[PDB]
Symmetry: C4
């Protein structure tokens, strides 16, 4: 009962901790439970189905509190696999990690809330989602690629920003008298910011052929400068994965 | 009459089966007949031209049933080219393939429908389109490239999802009292989901300068995080074709 | 007066013909005259400024007919530089090229129109724009890159098309009774086609939480599959220019 | 007091001038002061909060004039580090640079305005933003990448422009009689230009099944040709940074 003790310790703190193979199954399904619990929290908002959803939602709240209670327990046990955290002092200190203690705090809030309250449960659910990280890996990856392309990006942010201010001002001048949409500069900026991202709600549009004519030039330019940073970062991620691909195919 | 027998067997089960050269002509034109049959099925919906289209549509239904009846026949014959499926047992078992039997089932439904019915014919037409694959090659290609970029993508899905929930909640707080668009959280989420994809129907827009001010920041961020996965996959497909290009230029 | 004869022949049929250096100046400015002539043709449409624009437009029509008359003359003369088309037979046959004869036909139509008419002049102006090519180089380049990526693209066109038909049908079912936007399938297809491209006019939007819920899933998928082919072709052009870059840096 | 004199000269004309490390902190924070001063200039437009913002804005105007006055002073002093501009003649001529003299002119306008006026201060603030460059580096980078891809781009601009004119004309013909949106060609062009960029305000949309049918084809094409140049330039920037990456990893 030692090699089984020690084996299951290894593979469990493989799955619970940094997971490799089929542990992504478990990490996806725990994501599903926290996620669907957040969704039913949204169904609580509709007063026409508030009572029905609330019925099922306390129940799924039951299961979610039980799931993460046991997950907290099980990880603390299978954390014996750490060669630095072993037996007494390890497992008595491992729950002292930063993420772990905030995690137990979020979990205990989950515990009491079942023992104005819904604000608390919506937020703790969100921290389950953000609890997905435990490392900030996503933030690290995004920061790296944003850093590598700082000159190209800042080129796009500067030139796009200028096109916004310019086009908004011109349209404001041409359509300040004959239109009620463009009453003050702040309205012309809302209009510029909402066309250049190609959202185009339709609540403010120019209606004199001068406004149409000036928007039509800075539009053709600006809408393509607001769409660069998505294009630049998209290519950056793909290129970076190709390089990590080959580098890893060797080492 | 053997070498002609055997020649036309080869080139026909080249064209009907895995096609190389001018067989893409035939596969495109059969796609046209199934496609245009689906379109006339849509024209059936307009009651102002329902009768005219329905007139022509039973006729093109005639041709389509005849075409695929003969295609079923001709492929079963020219399937003698299979070195594993030869004469009796092959051609008597080749129609036992999974895709082939579902194909004959869809075809026989086509046969009876010309012998509440229009629901059946719209669906069988759809299965002609999905019958285009016979291999799931498109699904394989998409799955490969989605798999290769799982870390970059999940970075985008996580950070975009957070920006959605955050911006929707802030705008909901700033514009819950002075506006009828944002009545419940579920409305604020519909608004967030429809601006961040830059659809912008225009049915819900913020109208207090607090809502405009908070949307204008998470908008500039979010609309570019919802547009990544198209950008990442787009670069992924192009890069992958370049690598298959060179690799094949050798081997 | 021979070396000057022959020199200016060379550099002129350099500029007029396949241009290298500062001949792009001339080709841009001739593009400006044809272009601005088309624009004033559009100003003719507004009856409030029809007369003013029409005033200036016959005048710029004067200059444009004179410009291209002389260009036709000058190119036919400087075409002596062709080692195959020399003196009598060359310059007497060079105007027999396909593009040249259609060009003289368009020019002569320009001549007579100044000697229901505006339909003719709008069209001939368009053929000046399309006359920019003379080779179909742009069509060749686009066809090459579309050809190279046929498998990735057709993956996107197939999967996007399916998502359209599917989402439109589901939304049609959920919102056929409680809404006047979605009356027939053809309306649901117009709605699907206009959200998935993220145009979003706002004339048709779902208004029952079932329609919002089903659109919100196929939206998140579809809007990113309709945006691939721009992303794929965009990366394709950039990659191809890098390869032609290095290849030419050698040879 | 010489080595301290000379040391701080070096590191200061490192930070103020071409900055390397933590000088980006200072250059970001000076960007914040000019930027937030522009924003409060916009809050001046809303007459409901005009007085409150104007209150705080003269104050932040105080700090901004003092900041750039001292920056002008301090840079002129620490400009002794220039091996060509040293002591008397250098520091007496260094303020004779083009950017420096326009900068002092903008600064002195800032000085007098605190000693119809708001038009002047909004513009000078803008020139602080454009003063960020001092070199046109962003313009240089954009021009380089636009130049490198001139053939692919002009392919996109030509083919997209044709699709615009074509689709707008067809829709104009099909929906000129039965609709008030499309009254003249100029309206059909506004509609075409605003759908093809996927803005889609919603003020003009086709409403006869002929207009819907013709828009639906040139839409599927055009909206993807208007989105190329963002895609091409996006890939161009990313590719170019990868090449500068490796080249610099060597030299
Ligand atoms: C992808 C990460 O987030 C983005 O890079 N997005 C983004 C950021 C800025 C801009 N434009 C410049 C601008 C700056 C300030 C302003 F107040 C207004 C406009 C465009 C985009 N797409
Ligand atoms: C291309 C294949 O499909 C996509 O990757 N598309 C996509 C998927 C998700 C997101 N955002 C995150 C999100 C997640 C859940 C939610 F309920 C709401 C938002 C954005 C896009 N474009
Ligand atoms: C860039 C050159 O043109 C494009 O490749 N564009 C494009 C073509 C098709 C699709 N979707 C599939 C579809 C097919 C048929 C239909 F009737 C409806 C939808 C999307 C885009 N963007
Ligand atoms: C990124 C830098 O700016 C752009 O390249 N943008 C852009 C420029 C033109 C076009 N279309 C062609 C056209 C030309 C003239 C016209 F009067 C109307 C249409 C599309 C885009 N996106």
């Amino acid at each position: 009962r030692n090699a089984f003790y020690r084996k299951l310790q290894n593979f469990l703190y493989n799955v619970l901790e940094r997971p490799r193979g089929w542990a992504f199954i478990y990490h996806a399904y725990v994501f599903l439970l926290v996620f669907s619990c957040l969704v039913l929290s949204v169904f609580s908002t509709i007063k026409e189905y508030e009572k029905s959803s609330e019925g099922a939602l306390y129940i799924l709240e039951i299961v979610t509190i039980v799931v993460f209670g046991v997950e907290y327990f099980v990880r603390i046990w299978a954390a014996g696999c750490c060669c630095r955290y072993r037996g007494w002092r390890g497992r008595l200190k491992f729950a002292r990690k930063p993420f772990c203690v905030i995690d137990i705090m979020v979990l205990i809030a989950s515990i009491a809330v079942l023992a104005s309250a819904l604000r608390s449960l919506r937020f703790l659910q969100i921290l389950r989602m953000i609890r997905m990280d435990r490392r900030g890996g996503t933030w690290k990856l995004l920061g790296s690629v944003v850093y590598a392309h700082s000159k190209e990006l800042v080129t796009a942010w500067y030139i796009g920003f200028l096109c916004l201010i310019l086009a908004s001002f011109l349209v404001y001048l041409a359509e300040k008298g004959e239109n009620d949409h463009f009453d003050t500069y702040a309205d012309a900026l809302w209009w510029g910011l909402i066309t250049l991202t190609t959202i185009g709600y339709g609540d403010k549009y120019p209606q004199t052929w001068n406004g149409r004519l000036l928007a039509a030039t800075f539009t053709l330019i600006g809408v393509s400068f607001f769409a660069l940073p998505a294009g630049i970062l998209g290519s950056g991620f793909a290129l970076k994965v190709q390089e990590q691909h080959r580098q890893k195919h060797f080492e």
